[PDB]
C-alpha cells in the first residue's frame, strides 16, 4: 500500500495546490507529453457527510463544488483528478501530473522538483498560520519549582 | 454486448410518457409507443419503452423468470441503474407475462391507506389486446362506457372485477403487446360482458 499511499499523496498535494503556482511550476519544467482527454473537466457537487457529535451516525451537511478530469497518455497510462472548486484547467493539469507520476521516467524527477516543493510550501503556510492563531491562546497557569510554607 | 435504448433519450422518454399518461388517464384506450424499434426480447417494445421512461435507481424492478435473462438484466442495469429484485413484494415495477401466478399477483405491494402511491405497477405482456373475454370499463377517465377484450389470465381478471383491496389501495395495470399498450388503474370498474 506504500505505492497506493504514494499516489494518494501526490494527488492530495495537487488538489491543495494554488492553481497559479502549479501552472507556473509545471510550465517552468517544460515537459513535452502527448495526451488525450478521456473526461473533459466537469464541475459539479460533492455531497458532504458529517457525523452527529463528530463520531456518531452520518448526516448530510450540504455540498461543495468539485471538478473532475481524466487523461490518457500515449502508453495507456490513465491520470485522474477530483479537485474542490471550479477550475477546469487546473483539474486537467492535475490529471496530467497524476498520469506522468505513474511513469518511470517522471516519477522521481517530479517528486523532487514539483510535489515535494508544493507540499513544503503548503506545510509552511500551515505552520505560519498556526503561529498567528496561537497568539490568541488564553494563558491561565504555568508550572514552576519553589515556594514557601 | 448489451441492448440499445432510446436513440433520443430526452425526446423519446417524453413521447412514451405522454402515451402512457393518455392510457392511464383514459383507461382502455390503446396507445402506441413507436419511438423504440427493437424490444429487449422477450420484453416487447412497449414494456421496454415504459421501463426506459420510468425506471431508475429509485425504482426496484422485478422481472418474472420467463422474462428474466442476463442480457435484459445487464441492459436494464446499464441504461437505467434500476435495482433488480427477485421478489415481487419488493418491486415498484413488476413485469410478467400470461404465466403470472396467483401467489405472485397477491404478493405485489398495494400501497397503504395513508400512502396509496407506495405500491407496485404491474406491467403484463399479453398475447393480444383483442380476442379475449369482452369487458366493460366504467369510472374515472371514461365518459360513459368503454369495451375492451384483452387476453387476460383469470386471476388478473379476478383482481379487476372483485377489487380485493379497498380503494385507495391497489395495483395499477399496464397491458403491453408489441409496441402497443393499454392501462387500467385501480379506480376502473370492470365487468365481464
Amino acid at each position: 500500500h506504500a505505492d497506493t499511499a504514494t499516489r494518494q499523496h501526490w494527488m492530495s498535494v495537487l488538489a491543495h495546490s494554488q492553481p497559479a503556482e502549479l501552472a507556473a511550476r509545471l510550465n517552468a519544467l517544460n515537459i513535452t507529453a502527448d495526451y488525450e482527454v478521456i473526461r473533459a473537466a466537469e464541475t459539479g457537487l460533492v455531497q458532504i457527510q458529517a457525523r452527529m457529535g463528530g463520531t456518531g451516525e452520518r448526516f448530510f451537511a450540504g455540498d461543495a463544488t468539485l471538478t473532475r478530469a481524466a487523461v490518457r497518455l500515449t502508453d495507456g497510462t490513465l491520470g485522474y483528478s477530483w479537485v474542490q472548486g471550479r477550475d477546469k484547467q487546473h483539474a486537467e493539469r492535475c490529471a496530467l501530473i497524476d498520469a506522468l507520476m505513474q511513469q518511470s521516467r517522471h516519477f522521481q524527477n517530479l517528486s523532487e522538483t514539483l510535489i515535494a516543493p508544493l507540499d513544503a510550501d503548503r506545510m509552511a503556510r500551515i505552520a505560519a498560520r498556526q503561529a498567528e492563531v496561537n497568539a490568541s491562546r488564553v494563558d491561565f497557569f504555568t508550572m514552576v519549582r519553589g515556594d514557601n510554607a | 454486448t448489451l441492448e440499445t435504448a432510446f436513440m433520443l433519450p430526452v425526446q423519446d422518454a417524453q413521447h412514451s410518457f405522454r402515451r402512457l399518461l393518455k392510457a392511464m388517464s383514459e383507461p382502455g384506450v390503446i396507445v402506441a409507443l413507436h419511438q423504440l424499434k427493437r424490444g429487449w426480447q422477450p420484453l416487447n417494445i412497449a414494456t421496454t419503452s415504459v421501463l426506459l421512461t420510468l425506471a431508475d435507481n429509485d425504482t426496484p424492478v422485478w422481472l418474472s423468470t420467463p422474462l428474466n435473462n442476463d442480457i435484459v438484466n445487464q441492459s436494464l442495469r446499464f441504461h437505467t441503474n434500476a435495482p433488480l429484485v427477485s421478489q415481487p413484494e419488493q418491486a415498484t415495477f413488476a413485469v410478467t407475462d400470461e404465466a403470472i401466478s396467483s401467489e405472485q399477483l397477491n404478493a405485489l405491494s398495494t400501497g397503504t391507506a395513508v400512502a396509496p402511491e407506495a405500491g407496485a405497477t404491474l406491467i403484463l405482456q399479453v398475447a393480444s389486446l383483442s380476442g379475449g373475454r369482452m369487458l366493460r370499463l366504467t369510472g374515472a377517465g371514461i365518459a360513459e362506457e368503454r369495451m375492451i377484450a384483452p387476453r387476460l389470465p383469470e386471476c388478473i381478471l379476478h383482481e379487476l372485477t372483485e377489487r380485493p383491496h379497498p380503494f385507495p389501495l391497489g395495483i395499477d395495470l399496464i397491458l403491453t403487446c408489441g409496441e402497443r399498450l393499454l392501462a387500467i388503474p385501480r379506480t376502473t370498474h370492470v365487468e365481464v360482458c
Binding site: 492530495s12 457537487l45 457527510q49 448530510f60 450540504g62 461543495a64 463544488t65 473532475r68 485522474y80 474542490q84 | -
Partner: protein, 353 residues
C-alpha cells in the same frame, strides 16, 4: 371605449433594468468585485454558503453581489444554482478531530487540554462604530507565538471517558436526504440536522433563545466550539481508494444539555450538535440548541415550547420556502379578491341596518 394592450414584458424588462442600475450605483465609484466581497464580507459569505447549501466562497459572494447584498435573495440564487449541478461524489464522513484549528473554546472548564484558543473573534469587542474605516487603513501586523497545534481532544470525549456523557455511536444507519425526498414527520435525527443546517439563522436563533427562557428548557452549556479546516475525501469508483480533494473551513458546536437518569445505567448529560460552513458560529449554536429540543421523542419528553414541535419548527425553517411564500402576496391576486368582494358586498346589502 377601452381596449386591452400588452404591457407585462415591457414593464418587467424596465423594472429589472432599474434594479441593475441601482445595484451598480454611482459609477464614479468602482464596481465591487466578487473577490472583495469574498475576502472582506466573509461572514455574510459564511451564512449564504450554509443556507444556500454550496460551500463555494466565490459562488456565495457572486450571489451576494447579484442580490445587492440581500442575504435571502443570495441564498435563493445559490440554492437555485444547486439544482443545475450534477452530484459527482459523496464525501467520506468528515472527521472533526482532524481540524486544523482557527479557534477552540469551552465554557465548561476554565482551562482544557490544548487550551482556550480565541482565534479571530468579535467576542469581547466594545461595539463602538469605527470611523477610521471610512478611509483606507492598515491592518494590524500580527504577532506570532509558537507554531505547534497542541493536542486538542473534544471536550465531549473527556466527559464520556469519565462516564459523565455518552459517546455518539455509529450503527451504520444510512442518512436520510431531504433534497431527494419530501419531509414526512416524524423525521430521523439525521434528517432534522440536515434541515437545521439549511434553516434560517434568525428563526432558529429565536427558537433557541425561547428555550433558554423556559419554553422547552434544556439547560445548555457550550461544551466546545471549534472552527478550522477539515480535509474532504472521496472514494472514486475508478480507483477504489480514498482521494483527498481539498478542505472545508467549518465551525462545530457541541452543547451539553440537562442530565437524565436512565433505568439501567448511571445518570449522564444529554447533548446537541451544530455544524456550519465558515467562522460564523451563532447558527451552529442555534442548530445545537434546537437539535436537543427536537430530540424530545427519543427522550419521551413532552413539548413545553414551539422549539420542541417538530412540524412547526421544520415546516417553517427554510427561508427559500418562507420568503418565497410571504413575498408571493405581491403577485396579482385580483381574481381571488374579487371573489371575496362579491360576497362581502352581498353581505352588506343584506344588512342595511
Amino acid at each position: 371605449m377601452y381596449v386591452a394592450v400588452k404591457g407585462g414584458e415591457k414593464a418587467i424588462d424596465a423594472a429589472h433594468a432599474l434594479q441593475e442600475s441601482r445595484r451598480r450605483g454611482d459609477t464614479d465609484l468602482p464596481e465591487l468585485s466578487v473577490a472583495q466581497i469574498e475576502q472582506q464580507l466573509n461572514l455574510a459569505v459564511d451564512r449564504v454558503m450554509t443556507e444556500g447549501g454550496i460551500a463555494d466562497r466565490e459562488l456565495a459572494a457572486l450571489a451576494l453581489k447579484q442580490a445587492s447584498g440581500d442575504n435571502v435573495e443570495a441564498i435563493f440564487l445559490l440554492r437555485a444554482y444547486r439544482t443545475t449541478l450534477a452530484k459527482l461524489a459523496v464525501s467520506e464522513p468528515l472527521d472533526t478531530t482532524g481540524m486544523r484549528l482557527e479557534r477552540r473554546i469551552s465554557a465548561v472548564y476554565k482551562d482544557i487540554p490544548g487550551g482556550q484558543l480565541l482565534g479571530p473573534t468579535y467576542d469581547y469587542t466594545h461595539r463602538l462604530l469605527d470611523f477610521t474605516l471610512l478611509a483606507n487603513g492598515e491592518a494590524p501586523t500580527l504577532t506570532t507565538a509558537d507554531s505547534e497545534q497542541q493536542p486538542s481532544p473534544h471536550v465531549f470525549s473527556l466527559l464520556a471517558r469519565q462516564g459523565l456523557a455518552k459517546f455518539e455511536e455509529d450503527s451504520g444507519a444510512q442518512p436520510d436526504d431531504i433534497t431527494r425526498t419530501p419531509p414526512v414527520y416524524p423525521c430521523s435525527r439525521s434528517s432534522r440536522l440536515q434541515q437545521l443546517m439549511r434553516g434560517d439563522e434568525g428563526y432558529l436563533l429565536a427558537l433557541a433563545y425561547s428555550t433558554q427562557r423556559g419554553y422547552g428548557r434544556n439547560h445548555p452549556f457550550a461544551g466546545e466550539i471549534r472552527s478550522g479546516y477539515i480535509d474532504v475525501s472521496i472514494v472514486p469508483e475508478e480507483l477504489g481508494f480514498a482521494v483527498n480533494v481539498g478542505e472545508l473551513l467549518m465551525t462545530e458546536c457541541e452543547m451539553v444539555n440537562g442530565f437524565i437518569d436512565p433505568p439501567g445505567e448511571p445518570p449522564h448529560f444529554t447533548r446537541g450538535y451544530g455544524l456550519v460552513f465558515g467562522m460564523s458560529e451563532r447558527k451552529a449554536m442555534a442548530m445545537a440548541l434546537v437539535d436537543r429540543a427536537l430530540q424530545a421523542p427519543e427522550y419521551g419528553e413532552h413539548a413545553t415550547g414551539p422549539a420542541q414541535d417538530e412540524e412547526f419548527v421544520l415546516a417553517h425553517a427554510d427561508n427559500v420556502e418562507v420568503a418565497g411564500f410571504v413575498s408571493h402576496l405581491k403577485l396579482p391576486h385580483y381574481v381571488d379578491f374579487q371573489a371575496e368582494l362579491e360576497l362581502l358586498k352581498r353581505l352588506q346589502q343584506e344588512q342595511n341596518h
